[PDB]
Design an enzyme around this catalytic site. Structure first.
Site, PDB file in Angstrom:
ATOM      1  N   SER A   1      -1.747   1.418  16.634  1.00 25.74           N
ATOM      2  CA  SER A   1      -0.644   0.567  17.055  1.00 25.74           C
ATOM      3  C   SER A   1       0.104   0.088  15.806  1.00 25.74           C
ATOM      4  CB  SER A   1      -1.144  -0.678  17.804  1.00 25.74           C
ATOM      5  OG  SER A   1      -0.073  -1.581  18.045  1.00 25.74           O
TER       6      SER A   1
ATOM      7  N   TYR B   1      -6.172  -8.724  19.464  1.00 22.49           N
ATOM      8  CA  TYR B   1      -5.649  -7.377  19.663  1.00 22.49           C
ATOM      9  C   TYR B   1      -5.150  -6.774  18.362  1.00 22.49           C
ATOM     10  CZ  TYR B   1      -2.715  -3.577  21.332  1.00 22.49           C
ATOM     11  OH  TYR B   1      -2.109  -2.350  21.532  1.00 22.49           O
TER      12      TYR B   1
ATOM     13  N   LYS C   1      -6.498  -3.496  16.028  1.00 19.58           N
ATOM     14  CA  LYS C   1      -5.677  -2.348  15.663  1.00 19.58           C
ATOM     15  C   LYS C   1      -5.593  -2.153  14.163  1.00 19.58           C
ATOM     16  CE  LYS C   1      -4.773  -0.768  19.814  1.00 19.58           C
ATOM     17  NZ  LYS C   1      -5.210   0.617  20.160  1.00 19.58           N
TER      18      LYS C   1
ATOM     19  N   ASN D   1     -11.398  -1.693  21.640  1.00 11.13           N
ATOM     20  CA  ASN D   1     -10.337  -1.203  20.785  1.00 11.13           C
ATOM     21  C   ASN D   1     -10.843  -0.717  19.421  1.00 11.13           C
ATOM     22  OD1 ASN D   1      -8.765  -2.222  22.877  1.00 11.13           O
ATOM     23  ND2 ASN D   1      -7.583  -3.621  21.610  1.00 11.13           N
TER      24      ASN D   1
HETATM   25  N1  LIG Z   1       2.070  -0.011  25.238  1.00  8.73           N
HETATM   26  C1  LIG Z   1       2.475  -0.294  23.998  1.00  8.73           C
HETATM   27  O1  LIG Z   1       3.572  -0.829  23.796  1.00  8.73           O
HETATM   28  C2  LIG Z   1       1.510   0.133  22.889  1.00  8.73           C
HETATM   29  C3  LIG Z   1       1.924   0.133  21.559  1.00  8.73           C
HETATM   30  C4  LIG Z   1       1.054   0.529  20.545  1.00  8.73           C
HETATM   31  C5  LIG Z   1      -0.236   0.947  20.845  1.00  8.73           C
HETATM   32  N2  LIG Z   1      -0.668   0.964  22.185  1.00  8.73           N
HETATM   33  C6  LIG Z   1      -2.009   1.529  22.455  1.00  8.73           C
HETATM   34  O2  LIG Z   1      -1.834   2.736  23.212  1.00  8.73           O
HETATM   35  C7  LIG Z   1      -3.036   2.985  23.948  1.00  8.73           C
HETATM   36  C8  LIG Z   1      -2.620   3.114  25.430  1.00  8.73           C
HETATM   37  O3  LIG Z   1      -1.821   1.975  25.771  1.00  8.73           O
HETATM   38  P1  LIG Z   1      -0.958   1.896  27.126  1.00  8.73           P
HETATM   39  O4  LIG Z   1       0.327   1.225  26.793  1.00  8.73           O
HETATM   40  O5  LIG Z   1      -0.895   3.241  27.751  1.00  8.73           O
HETATM   41  O6  LIG Z   1      -1.851   0.932  28.043  1.00  8.73           O
HETATM   42  P2  LIG Z   1      -2.473   1.219  29.497  1.00  8.73           P
HETATM   43  O7  LIG Z   1      -3.137  -0.048  29.931  1.00  8.73           O
HETATM   44  O8  LIG Z   1      -1.436   1.779  30.395  1.00  8.73           O
HETATM   45  O9  LIG Z   1      -3.619   2.313  29.231  1.00  8.73           O
HETATM   46  C9  LIG Z   1      -4.899   1.921  28.723  1.00  8.73           C
HETATM   47  C10 LIG Z   1      -5.898   3.073  28.759  1.00  8.73           C
HETATM   48  O10 LIG Z   1      -7.120   2.689  28.109  1.00  8.73           O
HETATM   49  C11 LIG Z   1      -8.182   2.936  29.011  1.00  8.73           C
HETATM   50  N3  LIG Z   1      -9.381   2.101  28.819  1.00  8.73           N
HETATM   51  C12 LIG Z   1      -9.411   0.765  28.886  1.00  8.73           C
HETATM   52  N4  LIG Z   1     -10.665   0.342  28.751  1.00  8.73           N
HETATM   53  C13 LIG Z   1     -11.450   1.404  28.586  1.00  8.73           C
HETATM   54  C14 LIG Z   1     -12.816   1.556  28.390  1.00  8.73           C
HETATM   55  N5  LIG Z   1     -13.640   0.513  28.445  1.00  8.73           N
HETATM   56  N6  LIG Z   1     -13.353   2.845  28.242  1.00  8.73           N
HETATM   57  C15 LIG Z   1     -12.486   3.943  28.303  1.00  8.73           C
HETATM   58  N7  LIG Z   1     -11.195   3.733  28.464  1.00  8.73           N
HETATM   59  C16 LIG Z   1     -10.634   2.530  28.626  1.00  8.73           C
HETATM   60  C17 LIG Z   1      -7.570   2.732  30.400  1.00  8.73           C
HETATM   61  O11 LIG Z   1      -8.298   3.442  31.402  1.00  8.73           O
HETATM   62  C18 LIG Z   1      -6.219   3.433  30.203  1.00  8.73           C
HETATM   63  O12 LIG Z   1      -6.372   4.847  30.355  1.00  8.73           O
HETATM   64  C19 LIG Z   1      -3.913   1.741  23.809  1.00  8.73           C
HETATM   65  O13 LIG Z   1      -4.843   1.933  22.731  1.00  8.73           O
HETATM   66  C20 LIG Z   1      -2.886   0.676  23.357  1.00  8.73           C
HETATM   67  O14 LIG Z   1      -3.624  -0.349  22.696  1.00  8.73           O
HETATM   68  C21 LIG Z   1       0.211   0.551  23.188  1.00  8.73           C
END
Ligand SMILES: NC(=O)c1ccc[n+]([C@@H]2O[C@H](COP(=O)([O-])OP(=O)(O)OC[C@H]3O[C@@H](n4cnc5c(N)ncnc54)[C@H](O)[C@@H]3O)[C@@H](O)[C@H]2O)c1
Ligand SMILES: NC(=O)c1ccc[n+]([C@@H]2O[C@H](COP(=O)([O-])OP(=O)(O)OC[C@H]3O[C@@H](n4cnc5c(N)ncnc54)[C@H](O)[C@@H]3O)[C@@H](O)[C@H]2O)c1
Lengths: 254, 254
Positions: free
Chosen positions: B138, B151, B155, B107
């Site tokens: 985030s 986490y 962020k 992250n």
């Molecule tokens: N879902 C929420 O409510 C939320 C809110 C704020 C921020 N986020 C952030 O948004 C982004 C996507 O979240 P999401 O909800 O789609 O989750 P998700 O799990 O559906 O998607 C995660 C993505 O990160 C990729 N990833 C993980 N490890 C990796 C690595 N080692 N190398 C390259 N890629 C890697 C995965 O392949 C996937 O494409 C993330 O950074 C998450 O932290 C999510």
């Protein structure tokens, strides 16, 4: 927190801020002062012993980049010997944005891991008595020195982590607050590397503005410890001690 | 930013928020959309390709935890093909506070390293054309989900890093802004691990409060990209897009 007769572990007690904080701590008549640092400094140990012969001062080699199991092993022994520990101070840090991985490992990951480790002995859900953590973060965790973006980001991380620890205290029994020095004249800041050499003059320029000494910082650090305010975000800048109010931009509602 | 005929690299394009963002991006008539993800998703890749067959969509396996020099080798392959890249979107993330080191590595460290790598191709000090970086951070980097402190701290780190990148734009030629989703119905938030199991039911609890759709989030994400505001800190929460003002607690004066 009346520090009289307390037991304190200080990780990174022998650096610039560390040692001036330690000088002030031992003036307070601690029962035990346990120094955990990467390299032994016999001169500094002698100095602390001369300031207050009444305090039992002990040293253990400790590198925050070791795995959490190794930290648990060391802490287990200290808790066994002392029976109780009142306060943990997590002070380790480096400033060198040519060392991206190591900056993160020391300043962020390491602090999180020592914290995770000590919870084995403190967490009330495991039968422990709870405790207090003072994390040395930085004003750069509020607002970066953008020429050392990695350093500053690592400090933003530990500001956040500490805030969360304090909100978890009802569950773990472990309160926490952050100690956030402003620019303090120590070996950390006299010469250092900017990310991708964006500003080769970064220390020179930084030090062309008002600063404080490590003695001032150390004095205010112990005052913050004595205030003992879970969730406080203490700013130690220009020789003063101030609590800041964290902005509520968002709420999880949990 | 007019996305027409542009070349975009999106790290983690086919996960929850990434995929809806990707759907919106390729509707905008990109020349090239290059997806760099750790895991293949043929179904997702097929859907995207069908939206706008004119767009050239390329997938490459990419693990953000590899060393910088490995990232540079992959980016060289992409630049040699495309010649230019207009925008890099750093979207990798995991949520699992039982995996402390790996959370931080993916992250925080990984985002920093991909950024560091692409600066080799863009840095104006070496004759590069500059560029644009959109970092998916985030809202937890503003105010933690304290039950996932690691986490959230990771962020906070990337919110800070992104702020600093923007302030470095005069030096490097590389502008940046953060995209900070609130709670979005996607699967990262499905069942997840809290730090030291302080709260086994974080996902369930988060979803007991107003949230937004990933469609809504993707729509606002592309609006933010089109606004193309260096140093913006975009909140994408409850279906809206809002630029937040970072609190000034301290200033380095440099
Ligand atoms: N879902 C929420 O409510 C939320 C809110 C704020 C921020 N986020 C952030 O948004 C982004 C996507 O979240 P999401 O909800 O789609 O989750 P998700 O799990 O559906 O998607 C995660 C993505 O990160 C990729 N990833 C993980 N490890 C990796 C690595 N080692 N190398 C390259 N890629 C890697 C995965 O392949 C996937 O494409 C993330 O950074 C998450 O932290 C999510
Ligand atoms: N000097 C400043 O202006 C300033 C401002 C704000 C915050 N800080 C923070 O205060 C703390 C002390 O900084 P300082 O200015 O005294 O610098 P310093 O270089 O004098 O001291 C650094 C301390 O960290 C320890 N340390 C470094 N790497 C370690 C490792 N791998 N394991 C264990 N210990 C390790 C050193 O042994 C020493 O005790 C650091 O966290 C620093 O980031 C400094």
């Amino acid at each position: 927190m009346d520090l009289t007769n307390k037991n304190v572990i200080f990780v990174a007690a022998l650096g610039g801020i560390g040692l001036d904080t330690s000088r002030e701590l031992v003036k307070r008549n601690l029962k035990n002062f346990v120094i955990l640092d990467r390299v032994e400094n016999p001169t500094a140990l002698a100095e602390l012993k001369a300031i207050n012969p009444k305090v039992n001062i002990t040293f253990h080699t400790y590198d925050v980049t070791v795995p959490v199991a190794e930290s648990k092993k060391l802490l287990k022994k200290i808790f066994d010997q002392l029976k109780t520990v009142d306060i943990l101070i997590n002070g380790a840090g480096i400033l060198d944005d040519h060392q991206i991985e190591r900056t993160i490992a020391i300043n962020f990951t390491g602090l999180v891991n020592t914290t995770t480790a000590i919870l084995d002995f403190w967490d009330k859900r495991k039968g422990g008595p709870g405790g207090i953590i003072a994390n040395i973060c930085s004003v750069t965790g509020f607002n970066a020195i953008h020429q050392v973006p990695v350093y500053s980001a690592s400090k933003a991380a530990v500001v956040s982590f500490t805030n969360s620890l304090a909100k978890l205290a009802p569950i773990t029994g472990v309160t926490a607050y952050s100690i956030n020095p402003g620019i303090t004249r120590t070996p950390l800041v006299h010469t250092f590397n900017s990310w991708l050499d964006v500003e080769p003059r970064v220390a020179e320029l930084l030090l062309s503005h008002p600063t404080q000494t490590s003695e001032q910082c150390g004095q205010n650090f112990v005052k913050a410890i004595e205030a003992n305010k879970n969730g406080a975000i203490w700013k130690l800048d220009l020789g003063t001690l101030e609590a800041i109010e964290w902005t509520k931009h968002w709420d999880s509602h949990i």
